[PDB]
Amino acid sequence: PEKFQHILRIMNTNIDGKRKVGIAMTAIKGVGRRYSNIVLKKADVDLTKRAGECTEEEVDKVVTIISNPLQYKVPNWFLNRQKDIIDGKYWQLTSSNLDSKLRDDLERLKKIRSHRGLRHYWGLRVRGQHTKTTGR
Amino acid sequence: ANLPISKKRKFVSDGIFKAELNEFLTRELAEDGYSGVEVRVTPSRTEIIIMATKTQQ
Amino acid sequence: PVVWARVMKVLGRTGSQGQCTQVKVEFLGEQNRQIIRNVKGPVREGDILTLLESEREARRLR
Amino acid sequence: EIKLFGRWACDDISISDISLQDYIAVKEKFARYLPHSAGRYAAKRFRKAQCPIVERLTSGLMMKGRSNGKKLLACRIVKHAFEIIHLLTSENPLQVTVNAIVNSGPREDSTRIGRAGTVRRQAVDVSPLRRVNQAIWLICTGAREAAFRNIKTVAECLADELINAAKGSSNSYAIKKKDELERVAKSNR
Amino acid sequence: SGGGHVAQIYAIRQAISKALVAFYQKYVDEASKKEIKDILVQYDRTLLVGDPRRCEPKKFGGPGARARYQKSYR
Amino acid sequence: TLWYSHPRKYGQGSRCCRACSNRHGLIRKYGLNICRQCFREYANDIGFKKLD
Amino acid sequence: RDKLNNQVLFDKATYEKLYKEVPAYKLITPSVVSERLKIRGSLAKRALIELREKGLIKQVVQHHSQVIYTRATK
Amino acid sequence: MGRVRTKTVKKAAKVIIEKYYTRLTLDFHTNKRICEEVAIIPTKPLRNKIAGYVTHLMGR
Amino acid sequence: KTPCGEGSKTWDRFQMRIHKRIIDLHSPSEIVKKITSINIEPGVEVEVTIA
RNA sequence: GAACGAGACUCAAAUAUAUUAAAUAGAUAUCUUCAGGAUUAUGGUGCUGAAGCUUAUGUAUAUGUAAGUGGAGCCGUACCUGUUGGUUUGUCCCAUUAUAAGGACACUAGCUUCUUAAAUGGACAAAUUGCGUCUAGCAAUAAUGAGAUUGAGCAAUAACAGGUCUGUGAUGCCCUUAGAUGUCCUGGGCUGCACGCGCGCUACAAUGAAAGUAUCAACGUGUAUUUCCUAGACCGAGAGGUCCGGGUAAACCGCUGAACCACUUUCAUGCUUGGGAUUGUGAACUGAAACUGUUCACGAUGAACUUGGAAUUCCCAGUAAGUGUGAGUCAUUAACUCGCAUUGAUUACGUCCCUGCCCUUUGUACACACCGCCCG
């Protein structure tokens, strides 16, 4: 049966809740397509259920544990951004704060004038491979 | 060699010893017209003969 | 239409190699009126084909 | 006997197209359960003329790079496709395909003299051992384009059209491009 | 041992067809000589042949065994 | 000593070609170090008949 | 263009219409599930699990990515 | 597909006209075996090419 | 194959087959190296383990 | 009598293991924990406190289980399966530390099919209604493991202004060396990128994709001032860490028990978990030392691509193509090439159109040879 929600909404995006949550709830920006099943079975929800169910009485647990990953039994190497090292907090930024200090991290790369951040400014392919014919 | 190395290198580590020799006997004794060799690794000592046209050289 | 067509001979690959190996098709009701077609397709003796047009003769046998 | 290939029968099927039998010793003298003969079918000019209609389309779905080199996966599809044919009017796929390929082959006329200044001088007859040599191929092309993107999967789509190609125009799966070239080749001769 | 999956499946079907020609010819029966293979000259089911096909060697200059990469401007 | 650089026991340069001192053409599949271009005619006589 | 306005939706508000079905159904797969609209394939894995009454229905075999049903007709 | 025995098989094919007219007959496997003593074939598997010809020689 | 390998890529092969045959024994100590240097000839070195 | 080239020969492998035959590989029998078949045969026997489980627990884990409990089980034997290990000159032994020989006995109580090529073994077609001409009735598919296992190595005459002086202690002459081009001392570069071009890799998914679950390779490589193949524990989300073991190799990895393919579930064909380009942070590894980078995983990002214009490649059978693995250089890094196995089609079974190459006949005013010569 499916007559319940047909839509969802969390912080920073509206979840298009049509698909099954094993492939659906990674549409939040900052969550890997295996990181959902890492969190959701720790979030005590049945993964075989589609996203027409799993409304707010199941979303209530999943929202704060993104803000508190370390207090919810996930190790810090299985997190997105540990080793900041600025403030030392092993974070996981998501969909607003992913891009908030994205430019601020390479702002230091313009303060320290390093060629990694200069390649960000000049425009290349992301890493240091050959620019004889990639160069676009 | 006091090493227990197996047959896939024994026939070439002592095996290129005859080809590195083959121009060394050409170069050092070139006064004779050095023709060829015959080596025989016997127990406790090895001997190699050298054929030439000028043999009291 | 489905007018019967049995074969007599398979030839060299004329048609400038479309392997259009021509033939001298024999029919059922007669044995003497029967005459050439230039078919496409490899043929053994005994290929009982059925042809549409019995009016084309294609008179450039090689 | 050695009928009942998986489920039904290998006998009780003989259409006498007049006089377009004397085709192939198909399986009345060549009883089988699965078509997996191993390797040797390209050794003489005519080895597959002593070999059934039902061999070649099993291996005939092996194209497009990531789908060739898989025959026993392809025989799985077509064996399970064969009871879709038991679900369409409950007719066995022997007189579904052999009644297809009478009409699923381009009849007699195809257009090739293309090494000349034009192309239009064309074949008087097509040999029936080359009718079936691509009549099995026309339905493979219709099998991919039906099951390409979103429509309906490979297991039902080729069996969707074998009795629909038992006679004429349903759509342009393959029935058109069996009738496309035949009217051209008499518009050219 | 050896081969892949269906190589051995093509071999274990050979196995007892290898045996009834090698174990009916000593004590059992000589009706079991000729109707061994009247069943299998109607078929032969590639069962009494030492199949000579084998993976042919790869030659130089290309990736295939009998196929060498080109289109290099001519 | 001082400025006596490159402890060359990483990478082939320069533990290479005791026979002919050719750097970038080394062959090592039995441990020979013999300039493989020279090896094409040194193969006789070190066995190495082309049987096929 | 079958862009299929669709949420992956269980919808037992059409399961009283999921016995409109079997007259005159004959070829029911999750791929010919496109006959009914609101076409699914993954909740339509679930949608014919309880279509196995062995009465008014018949299947051949369940298989990975291969499901085929029909009517047990007269 | 040579349709005659092609290369230099008259090393034996015209020495058996008078020097070995007899000492053989129409059997192909007999004169398979008589060739080994009449000439020192140094690598043998040339032998049946210069033995198998007598099936065409004595018939002609 | 070619030195300074510019042009018409070609390859060569260097086969060298080492063959060996094994013969058993259960015998006293020195009765086999009474056949020490016969028949010795270049290419073969014969190993015998008395254990 | 010409002679070389081509044939012929040489290799792999198909092929008879008849013969020679075993650290290995083994078929075979034998023996090693009733191996469930009281659903092939059978006994002490079962509702009668038995197996099982409760309590206190006896090294401040033997945990039997009698007692609590339980309602019926514990115990006998086997044709078949399933076994440590031992029967390759044996069953007892003589002898020997023990094996072999010595005896009886089988009087072979593990042999040569496979693994292993040692040597031999193996295609010639007699016959094809037409006086194809008293010479090729090649319709004998047959016959047959085989019409070659058929793939390869060698490769003449003639030369090119093909490539290499930066393969070398092959080298002319040239050049520079007390102001070195050498030799290098350090680092950078060969990886610089608005662009053109080349061979490739990965994909553009629902024959698929995803997590499990079934299970088979072959070619071979394998450490010795050691830095390699690797077993088996330990510690680790993983990368990787500690401590020991085997293999100089048919012995150990290793039944090299590889990968798609097989099955089941999860995704429904959404530019979506198709696809992984890009990119931040951490965790690591070798190199003294790692940055338009030396590689390797973890979370995160999810670019183009929905099959590719003009054109243009490779190939006729275990081939193409799919899928792996070995080896090469290798401290570390393979998308590369040299091998190898595995899955295994289509479509010819042929012509000279296309583009080349040969043969002559023929034209020529060309002969640095039609990229010619050459006219106003």
Side-chain angles (χ1 to χ4, degrees), chain B:
Chain B
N2 54 79
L3 316 184
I5 309 297
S6 189
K7 297 177 292 296
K8 78 195 311 206
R9 284 153 58 180
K10 293 286 102 176
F11 279 172
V12 306
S13 44
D14 298 309
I16 69 176
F17 185 68
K18 73 196 169 294
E20 190 134 19
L21 171 142
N22 201 293
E23 72 95 18
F24 193 76
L25 301 182
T26 302
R27 210 73 87 89
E28 278 277 356
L29 60 160
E31 57 269 18
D32 60 348
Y34 148 74
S35 177
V37 295
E38 174 269 321
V39 69
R40 179 50 256 182
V41 176
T42 66
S44 79
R45 86 292 193 277
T46 175
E47 63 269 14
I48 179 169
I49 71 174
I50 293 96
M51 62 183 180
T53 61
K54 177 68 167 63
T55 71
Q56 63 266 18
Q57 181 268 335

Side-chain angles (χ1 to χ4, degrees), chain C residues 9-36:
Chain C
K9 48 191 275 287
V10 60
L11 274 301
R13 274 68 45 204
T14 66
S16 73
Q17 185 62 282
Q19 59 270 13
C20 299
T21 74
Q22 64 272 10
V23 66
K24 184 169 185 289
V25 192
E26 171 60 85
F27 275 30
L28 265 64
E30 47 88 19
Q31 290 298 300
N32 46 3
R33 197 267 330 139
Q34 52 90 203
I35 210 64
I36 313 298

Side-chain angles (χ1 to χ4, degrees), chain A residues 31-67:
Chain A
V31 162
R33 54 183 64 95
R34 87 154 68 100
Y35 186 78
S36 80
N37 318 131
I38 283 171
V39 166
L40 282 177
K41 73 172 62 55
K42 187 260 291 179
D44 296 331
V45 71
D46 42 347
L47 268 299
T48 187
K49 202 171 65 185
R50 282 240 177 189
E53 200 60 35
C54 188
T55 174
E56 186 46 54
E57 76 270 0
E58 292 100 343
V59 191
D60 43 4
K61 207 261 178 182
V62 316
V63 287
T64 176
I65 66 186
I66 311 300
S67 69

Side-chain angles (χ1 to χ4, degrees), chain A residues 2 6-8 14-19 24 50-52, chain G residues 7-8:
Chain A
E2 211 284 324
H6 293 89
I7 199 65
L8 268 190
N14 168 266
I15 295 181
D16 297 334
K18 189 250 162 187
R19 306 181 306 256
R50 282 240 177 189
Chain G
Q7 200 276 323
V8 194

